Amino acid sequence: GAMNSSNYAELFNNDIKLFVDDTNVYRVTVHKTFEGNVATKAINGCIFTLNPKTGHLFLKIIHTSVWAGQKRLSQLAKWKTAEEVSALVRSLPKEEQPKQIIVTRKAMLDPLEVHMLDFPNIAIRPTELRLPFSAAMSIDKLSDVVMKATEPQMVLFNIYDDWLDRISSYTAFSRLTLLLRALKTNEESAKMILLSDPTITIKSYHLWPSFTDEQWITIESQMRDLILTEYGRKYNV
Amino acid sequence: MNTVPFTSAPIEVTIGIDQYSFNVKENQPFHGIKDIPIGHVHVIHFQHADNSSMRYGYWFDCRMGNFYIQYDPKDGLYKMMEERDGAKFENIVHNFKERQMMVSYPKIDEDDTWYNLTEFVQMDKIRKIVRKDENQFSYVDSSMTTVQENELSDPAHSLNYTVINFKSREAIRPGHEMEDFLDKSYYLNTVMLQGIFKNSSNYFGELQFAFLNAMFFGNYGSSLQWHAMIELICSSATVPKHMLDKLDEILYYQIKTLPEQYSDILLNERVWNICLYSSFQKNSLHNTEKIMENKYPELL
């Protein structure tokens, strides 16, 4: 069934599973026309498909050309997401295909289910968790590759860099979601925290800085503090 | 006009014939129903005074033979049977009339209700949903499950309704995933109408039979099947105009006939609100929409 706090450790067992987040598939700017009416301009987006156990990210870039001449784009974006995830499963060898796909938004269930009809043993599941994967475009290297794309394109990343050499998936996922939660609640502060110290660099093949273990502890504390402060501000607590 | 005699009435039971019904007391001298209109299917149904669970009954057509009811004290229920001795049968019917121990099918001449509820129902199709080919009549009851229900246990006792499933390969052409799921026209017209049912009239007949089974026996899988077949039409953008107009009449008389107190379990809120107000055919069911609003505005 649905995924929640109770059955959270299932993410880190050895059953292959993927999260799919469609929040950044259809992205627009809103602007005024000469005659004063409002219009949208699409920019490039991406499907965020992540194996939480291994860090493997399948970033499917959605080029604005997909939308040309189409109506009801927000609805279409859900079916294009499902189309692309299904194609991704088909492209993987059998022993790499997931046993479950967890969609971060319930509106994706019917489209994926319909697109996955060829895979009746792949379970499509919703989640009750409030996952922060929308903030994926706050990771500079991911936003950069999406905005530069001139055609549809799949880019692979490990979203955990090399963390699993030293920590477990559980902890890696907790760090990732903390980082993203912070970037989501106050991107400017979050990014300030990550880069304040110019002597800690990001490897060419990484997304995040090469913090030592001790420095990751200071970072994670700084992100937690940021998140709590923003809460009191939002609600006056 | 035809007759269905009863051997006796040993147990207190409410007897129904089509939309009419009568209370019969234990060992009351009751011996049949006469003046049954030839030309339509009919259903005789029962509910014992002691077990207000398990409504059950028999679908039949008097053209197909001479049928009668007899209580079986081993199995504990009124059984329909066929008399092959045509003479022996007219003998029993005439003497029970002479002794006036039979109720008359109480049809008002102005009233086309039963015609309207059974317009497309044909005994031959009923016998393919209720497979029991040694009898010419068909038993149905409250608890019988459908073939689709069984897939998600005893097949001899199944309702073999046509399986409809909106999230199946049948329903969805590869490459037209989004199209076919938002616009079921393909599934309705090519797969179901041209492919399985062959014509609109067989489709309507199963739809009507599923409704009558849900209404008369509270058969839950039948209710599911009636709603699915309505939803398949209302969720298709391209439907023959003759089907839409006829559907509006069919549903009207079904909603009209339903017991007011049963609207809660028999009427699926989601399906009706989607059909009447959200679907492609929202504007094609004026009579069904008008009676639903005036009689069950709560459900909507």
Side-chain angles (χ1 to χ4, degrees), chain A residues 1-235, chain B residues 1-151 154-300:
Chain A
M3 223 260 297
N4 50 33
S5 297
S6 324
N7 56 26
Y8 176 96
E10 189 177 9
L11 293 174
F12 316 109
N13 71 12
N14 299 110
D15 287 356
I16 301 175
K17 48 183 74 59
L18 301 168
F19 277 112
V20 174
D21 183 85
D22 68 313
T23 301
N24 290 305
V25 167
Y26 171 53
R27 294 205 286 169
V28 290
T29 47
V30 189
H31 67 267
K32 283 273 202 69
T33 69
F34 183 89
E35 294 83 8
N37 310 129
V38 181
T40 55
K41 174 194 175 297
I43 62 162
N44 289 341
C46 55
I47 306 164
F48 181 99
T49 298
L50 169 72
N51 177 330
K53 176 76 170 161
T54 65
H56 287 207
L57 175 63
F58 300 86
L59 192 76
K60 177 59 191 233
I61 302 185
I62 303 297
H63 185 259
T64 50
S65 69
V66 176
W67 315 127
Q70 323 286 330
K71 276 94 180 79
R72 285 185 69 71
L73 295 181
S74 76
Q75 167 187 268
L76 175 62
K78 294 176 205 316
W79 290 88
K80 174 74 174 170
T81 295
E83 191 176 11
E84 288 298 346
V85 163
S86 181
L88 173 58
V89 172
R90 286 166 217 284
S91 79
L92 290 159
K94 177 183 198 218
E95 63 276 8
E96 293 180 54
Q97 294 179 344
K99 289 135 237 174
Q100 298 165 35
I101 303 171
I102 307 161
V103 297
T104 60
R105 310 199 288 175
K106 310 190 171 63
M108 283 295 316
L109 284 170
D110 280 347
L112 199 49
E113 197 164 310
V114 167
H115 271 285
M116 299 285 295
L117 278 174
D118 297 322
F119 296 96
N121 298 351
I122 297 184
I124 311 308
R125 305 172 69 194
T127 179
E128 295 302 340
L129 307 177
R130 46 265 210 167
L131 289 158
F133 300 148
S134 71
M137 290 300 91
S138 290
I139 304 175
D140 291 319
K141 286 194 191 181
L142 303 184
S143 176
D144 285 335
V145 77
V146 167
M147 290 313 290
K148 293 210 239 304
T150 59
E151 48 191 355
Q153 181 182 2
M154 167 80 92
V155 188
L156 307 181
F157 293 87
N158 193 310
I159 206 169
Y160 297 148
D161 295 339
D162 65 344
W163 304 344
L164 295 174
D165 289 354
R166 321 185 43 77
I167 66 180
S168 60
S169 301
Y170 180 99
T171 305
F173 189 81
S174 296
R175 180 180 296 163
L176 172 68
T177 54
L178 164 64
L179 289 168
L180 290 171
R181 181 66 73 202
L183 289 159
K184 184 161 178 169
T185 319
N186 185 329
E187 172 186 51
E188 196 215 308
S189 293
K191 288 193 169 184
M192 283 178 65
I193 296 161
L194 286 165
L195 326 168
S196 65
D197 181 337
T199 82
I200 318 185
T201 64
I202 306 175
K203 295 285 149 290
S204 56
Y205 51 84
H206 280 176
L207 305 176
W208 315 95
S210 302
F211 294 117
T212 71
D213 288 2
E214 301 301 77
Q215 290 168 354
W216 268 123
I217 299 299
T218 311
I219 293 300
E220 292 167 314
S221 170
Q222 294 183 20
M223 299 289 189
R224 294 190 192 96
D225 287 328
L226 176 166
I227 292 160
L228 311 169
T229 293
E230 284 301 325
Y231 184 95
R233 185 196 194 288
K234 315 315 168 66
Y235 298 86
Chain B
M1 315 306 284
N2 267 127
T3 303
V4 172
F6 282 46
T7 290
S8 57
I11 64 155
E12 191 179 346
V13 58
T14 299
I15 295 163
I17 169 80
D18 299 353
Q19 68 269 38
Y20 312 102
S21 76
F22 317 107
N23 309 296
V24 175
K25 293 296 159 303
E26 172 193 287
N27 282 302
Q28 167 184 334
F30 173 99
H31 287 285
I33 308 170
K34 61 167 195 174
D35 307 328
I36 298 167
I38 300 162
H40 315 115
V41 304
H42 295 286
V43 61
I44 284 171
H45 42 103
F46 302 90
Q47 175 167 225
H48 303 171
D50 64 10
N51 197 75
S52 97
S53 302
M54 181 192 66
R55 288 173 267 160
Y56 62 99
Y58 306 89
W59 288 93
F60 63 101
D61 177 355
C62 285
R63 291 171 287 190
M64 305 301 294
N66 301 311
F67 308 114
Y68 68 107
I69 300 293
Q70 191 169 97
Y71 181 69
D72 176 2
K74 182 152 158 138
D75 288 6
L77 79 189
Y78 289 95
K79 296 188 160 170
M80 173 159 280
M81 296 172 298
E82 178 170 7
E83 179 57 66
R84 73 161 289 121
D85 184 352
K88 180 182 187 176
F89 183 84
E90 297 161 24
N91 158 257
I92 289 312
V93 165
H94 167 281
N95 169 76
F96 280 157
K97 285 192 190 192
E98 270 290 40
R99 309 247 271 154
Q100 297 202 43
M101 304 274 134
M102 305 191 176
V103 296
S104 168
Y105 184 97
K107 189 193 173 298
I108 299 312
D109 318 285
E110 172 200 46
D111 183 47
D112 276 351
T113 297
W114 189 245
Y115 175 82
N116 301 338
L117 295 168
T118 58
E119 178 164 0
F120 304 96
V121 183
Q122 301 279 14
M123 206 56 234
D124 74 278
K125 302 301 203 309
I126 292 183
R127 304 187 69 257
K128 298 179 198 308
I129 298 164
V130 195
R131 310 177 173 286
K132 183 148 200 275
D133 291 355
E134 61 274 14
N135 300 335
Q136 287 274 284
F137 51 86
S138 297
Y139 173 94
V140 177
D141 70 21
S142 292
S143 61
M144 277 171 61
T145 56
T146 69
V147 157
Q148 183 174 62
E149 287 181 308
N150 290 346
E151 300 171 346
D154 187 2
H157 219 60
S158 291
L159 299 168
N160 305 270
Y161 294 116
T162 301
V163 175
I164 306 181
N165 174 2
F166 295 142
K167 293 196 278 177
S168 74
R169 174 54 62 215
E170 293 68 48
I172 301 290
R173 279 174 305 184
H176 305 246
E177 276 78 18
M178 178 188 186
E179 183 196 3
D180 278 354
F181 181 78
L182 293 177
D183 175 11
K184 314 203 183 288
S185 285
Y186 156 71
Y187 194 30
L188 168 67
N189 290 306
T190 287
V191 171
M192 287 274 168
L193 286 177
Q194 298 155 211
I196 300 186
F197 285 101
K198 307 305 188 190
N199 55 58
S200 46
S201 298
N202 299 330
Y203 186 99
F204 285 141
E206 181 167 326
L207 184 168
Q208 288 181 314
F209 180 56
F211 170 76
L212 289 172
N213 280 328
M215 183 177 54
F216 283 126
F217 312 111
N219 188 274
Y220 175 77
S222 299
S223 198
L224 281 167
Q225 180 73 8
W226 174 60
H227 284 95
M229 304 184 67
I230 301 170
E231 185 167 6
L232 176 52
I233 287 167
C234 296
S235 296
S236 299
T238 302
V239 173
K241 308 88 159 51
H242 81 272
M243 276 187 63
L244 295 178
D245 299 325
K246 188 67 79 156
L247 180 59
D248 192 31
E249 289 304 307
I250 289 173
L251 301 175
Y252 172 85
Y253 285 107
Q254 286 162 348
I255 301 314
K256 193 186 186 57
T257 300
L258 274 185
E260 295 74 25
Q261 301 304 329
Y262 287 55
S263 37
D264 39 313
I265 30 179
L266 283 176
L267 290 174
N268 185 291
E269 177 175 85
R270 168 195 72 95
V271 170
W272 285 98
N273 283 280
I274 271 60
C275 290
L276 296 173
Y277 303 122
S278 301
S279 79
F280 289 112
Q281 308 297 346
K282 61 188 168 299
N283 294 320
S284 323
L285 297 182
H286 296 129
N287 294 348
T288 295
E289 188 179 295
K290 194 170 285 301
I291 198 181
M292 276 285 291
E293 301 186 356
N294 272 275
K295 188 176 179 194
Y296 306 123
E298 333 86 52
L299 182 95
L300 321 164

